[PDB]
Design a protein around this ligand. Structure first.
Ligand SMILES: [Ca+2]
Ligand SMILES: [Ca+2]
Ligand SMILES: [Zn+2]
Ligand SMILES: [Zn+2]
Ligand SMILES: [Zn+2]
Ligand SMILES: [Zn+2]
Lengths: 237, 237
């Protein structure tokens, strides 16, 4: 089927599908039910930063979410991606609303992946950084209700003309070029992503969150994945 | 039509279409008839390196071709790309044979482009480096007779099973993601490419050469562009 490894910034607690009783950050390996979560002091109307790192030596995936003058929430998970993901992938950002709403605005996004093979510091590396999004972002595969150009930001889910979030929305943003995430003969494979966001809610119930994800090249928004499924999962298995 | 800016490493002199009476390096702006050339002491069976640089302040495009222990051939041309190329492009490597043949092997290839806008060192940057090509290079749009995996090299034009170049061949290799090459509000736009090659010929008449080029997103091998047209041009205008 569709393979998904993601780091979710889950703003709405769905105690029923395993979500902790509070807003959290988690590492989802093929399931909306995180393999590890951590309490995240979500701050409405603030600009946050998420950094995700992984290297094939420690075989550990970690994320750090922070706001200026707010302690960071950290979550790590031991996982060897050499066997949960295919050699070639695509990386993206996802977000969704459902019953409750919030803006899922991405202000910037960078990414680097490196494959140090056989010898020296000769590598295969891909790197991109967006500090501003063009209204005609030709290097981003936009999916669902995700758009760009609104002040140079990337809006992952439907927002109003006057400036107010719409619920029941789903939108992804995948980088155009496939990424060679791992390889048989690589001594060290590593990657690191960083992006800033602004999650603001009109009502006091913000929902449902942003997600950095690594999927197969051909991935598309799963059927009926709005609200709690973050635009990444078909069911809540 | 199809826009092409290229830096050719022309091994065969076609005096008739403007080529100097010897192997050269040139800067072609929309024409196979270079806007500036320079003598290049081509060396059969050797590994060479080409570096191309451009920045929007000097509005100058330059290239340097060199072999270890051989003087570099240099060619620069004043050209403002803000008006010969569209905002979004694709970058690639081209090569061709015709009546005469040679290998057009690419051993490695890197590229970086940067757009420093409004303020600080915040940018939009794309970077890639291939120090070895996979048999299933999913991030390279291969065209014509170009292939990968042969010892981790990229062969731009048809070669034999035993190891010997075939004439009348044309192949390009474009990076998958479109590159935002310039923009209206950018203080400094710049790029730099570097690639190593091995041009070896069985007979004493090597032909016809490799070319780094920047074209529109949708570009494809022009009809009947083998031999002297390097896989980039429809006619010899
Ligand atoms: Ca949730
Ligand atoms: Ca020629
Ligand atoms: Zn969750
Ligand atoms: Zn493994
Ligand atoms: Zn020429
Ligand atoms: Zn200009």
């Amino acid at each position: 089927a569709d393979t998904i490894v993601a780091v979710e910034l889950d703003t709405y607690p769905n105690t029923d599908i395993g979500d902790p009783s509070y807003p959290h950050i988690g590492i989802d390996i093929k399931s909306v039910r995180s393999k590890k979560t951590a309490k995240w002091n979500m701050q409405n109307g603030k600009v946050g930063t998420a950094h995700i790192i992984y290297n094939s030596v420690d075989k550990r995936l970690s994320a750090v979410v922070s706001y200026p003058n707010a302690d960071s929430a950290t979550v790590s998970y031991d996982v060897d991606l050499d066997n949960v993901l295919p050699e070639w992938v695509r990386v993206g950002l996802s977000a969704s609303t459902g019953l409750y709403k919030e803006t899922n605005t991405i202000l910037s996004w960078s990414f680097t992946s490196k494959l140090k093979s056989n010898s020296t510091h000769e590598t295969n590396a891909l790197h991109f950084m967006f500090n501003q999004f063009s209204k005609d972002q030709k290097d981003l595969i936009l999916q669902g209700d995700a758009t760009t150009g609104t002040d140079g930001n990337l809006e992952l889910t439907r927002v109003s003309s006057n400036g107010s979030p719409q619920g029941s929305s789903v939108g992804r943003a995948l980088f155009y070029a496939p990424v060679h995430i791992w390889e048989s003969s690589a001594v060290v494979a590593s990657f690191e992503a960083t992006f800033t966001f602004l999650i603001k809610s009109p009502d006091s119930h913000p929902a449902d969150g942003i997600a950095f994800f690594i999927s197969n090249i051909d991935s598309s928004i799963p059927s009926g994945s709005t609200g709690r499924l973050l635009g990444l999962f078909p069911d809540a298995n």
